[PDB]
Amino acid sequence: AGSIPGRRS
Amino acid sequence: AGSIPGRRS
Amino acid sequence: MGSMERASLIQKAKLAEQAERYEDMAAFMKGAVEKGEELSCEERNLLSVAYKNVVGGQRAAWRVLSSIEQKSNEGPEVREYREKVETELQGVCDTVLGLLDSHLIKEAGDAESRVFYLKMKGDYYRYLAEVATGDDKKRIIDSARSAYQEAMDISKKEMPPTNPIRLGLALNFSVFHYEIANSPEEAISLAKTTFDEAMADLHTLSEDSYKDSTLIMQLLRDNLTLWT
Amino acid sequence: MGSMERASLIQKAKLAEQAERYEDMAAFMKGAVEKGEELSCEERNLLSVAYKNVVGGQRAAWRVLSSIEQKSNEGPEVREYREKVETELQGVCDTVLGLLDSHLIKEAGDAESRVFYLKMKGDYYRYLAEVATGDDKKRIIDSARSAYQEAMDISKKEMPPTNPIRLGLALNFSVFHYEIANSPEEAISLAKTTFDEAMADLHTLSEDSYKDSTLIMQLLRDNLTLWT
Ligand SMILES: *Cc1ccc(C(=O)NCc2cnn(C)c2)cc1
Ligand SMILES: *Cc1ccc(C(=O)NCc2cnn(C)c2)cc1
Ligand SMILES: [Ca+2]
Ligand SMILES: [Ca+2]
Ligand SMILES: [Cl-]
Ligand SMILES: [Cl-]
Ligand SMILES: [Cl-]
Ligand SMILES: [Cl-]
User: Fold this and answer.
1) Could you tell me the CATH number of the domain that includes residue C218?
2) Checking phi first, is residue C20 left (phi over 0); if not, alpha (psi -120 to 50) or beta?
3) Taking burial as the number of CB atoms within 10 A of a residue's CB, which of C142, C224, D104, D108 is the most buried?
4) Which cysteine pairs are covalently linked by disulfides here (chains A, B)?
C-alpha cells in the first residue's frame, strides 16, 4: 500500500 | 570508464 | 546552522536534493525553519522531501532488520542493531514533530500551509507507530489520527476535491487506516470517496492541474486495487 | 567501537550491508580493523564494500556539485557546498588510508591480502586525485601509481592471470591511467594484455571460477569498447 511519494521536490 | 564495482559483498 | 543566511540554507537544500544528499538537505531545511520565519509553498516542499527521504531510508532498513530478527526467533546482535536503527528513526521523527510544534503549525493560517503541516504531523506519528510496541503505541496512533483528522476537516472546508494536498492527505490517512489502525474498510471507503469526488471535479481544471490531480488519483486507485 | 566484540562488529557489518546502511557498515568494519587482528578474505571484502559504497555516494555528489559550479563560472553557496562534500570525501579517503597504514598492509604477507590492500591504497589515492587541484595533485597521483605498481608486481609473480583480485587490480589501474594520469594508451594496452592473458588461462578453471573471471574480463572489454 503506497503513501504519497515525497520523492522529488 | 568503469572501475571494479565493490557493489555487493 | 545559526550562522548561515536563511536564503543560503534554502539554496543549499536545493543543491543537496540535486546531489541526493538528503541528510544534508534535512539539516539545511531544519536550519531554515529555525530562522523563525514562515515557509513558502516551495520551502514547505523542500522540508517535506528532505525528511521523507531520510526517514524512508531508515524505515526500509528497519524493516529489513525486523524481518531478520523475526526469522531468528522461531546472539543479541540483530536485536541490538534493529534497536539502534529504530532509535535513530525515532529521533528523526521527534525532530520533525518538534519543528511542526515549534512553531510551524501555530503560525500556519492558510489552508494550504496548515493542512500540509498537519498531514506531516500525522505522517511522522504514523512512522513512530510503525515501530511502536510498548505502553504508548495506542497514544501514538491516536496522535496520528488526531492530526490527520484536523487536516481532513480543514481540507474538506477549504480546498477543492482535486487539490493535490487534499488528495495526498486522504491517500496517507487511508494508508493509516489500513496499515496502522486495523480499519481496512475505513481505508477503502476513504480512498473510494476521495477518488470519486475528485473525478467529478476534474472538468474544472487546466491541462497542468489535471495532470497533477490524476497522478495522485492513480495512487488511490493502485491502493484500492491492492485492497480489493 | 572499542567496547564491542570483534565478532559482533563483523556480524553487524553483514546486517548493515543487507539493510544498505553503508555508513554503519564502514564504522563497524573500522572498529573490527582497530581490534588489531588480521582480516580474513571475507572480512577484507566487507571492509572494501563498505567504504566503496560510502565514498561512491560522496564522489557522485561531488560530481553533481562540481558540474553545477562550473556552469556558474561561465553567490558563494555552490562552491561552499562542493567544498563541504569534498572535505568529507577526503576525510573518508584519509580514514581508509590510515587503516591500511595502521596496520593492515605491514601485516599482510600473503599475495591475496597484500595485493588486495595495495589495490585499495591505490584506489583511495585515486579518489583523492579526482578532487585534487593544488600543489599536491602530482604527489597524490604518484602515491596512487606507486601503490598500484607494487600490487601489480606482486600479482604478476604470485597469482594466475585469471585471479579476480589480479583482474580487478588491472582494471582499476587501467582506469587510473585513463582518467587520472592522462595515459590512455597505457590504459588500453594494460586492459588488452590483461584480457588476452586471462583468456588464455580460462581452460584451467572450474565452472564457478570461470564465471568469476569472465565477469571481470567483460568489464575490461567494456572499457576497451569505450576507449577505442
Ligand atoms: C501531502 C502531499 C500531497 C501531494 C504531494 C505531491 O504532489 N507529490 C508529487 C507526486 C504526484 N504524484 N506522484 C507520484 C508524486 C506531496 C505531498
Ligand atoms: C579488487 C577486487 C577485485 C575483484 C572484485 C570482485 O570480484 N567483485 C565482484 C564482481 C565481479 N564482477 N562484477 C560486476 C562484480 C572486487 C574487488
Ligand atoms: Ca539574515
Ligand atoms: Ca574480544
Ligand atoms: Cl548496534
Ligand atoms: Cl501565518
Ligand atoms: Cl555548506
Ligand atoms: Cl601476516
Assistant:
1) 1.20.190.20
2) left
3) D104
4) none
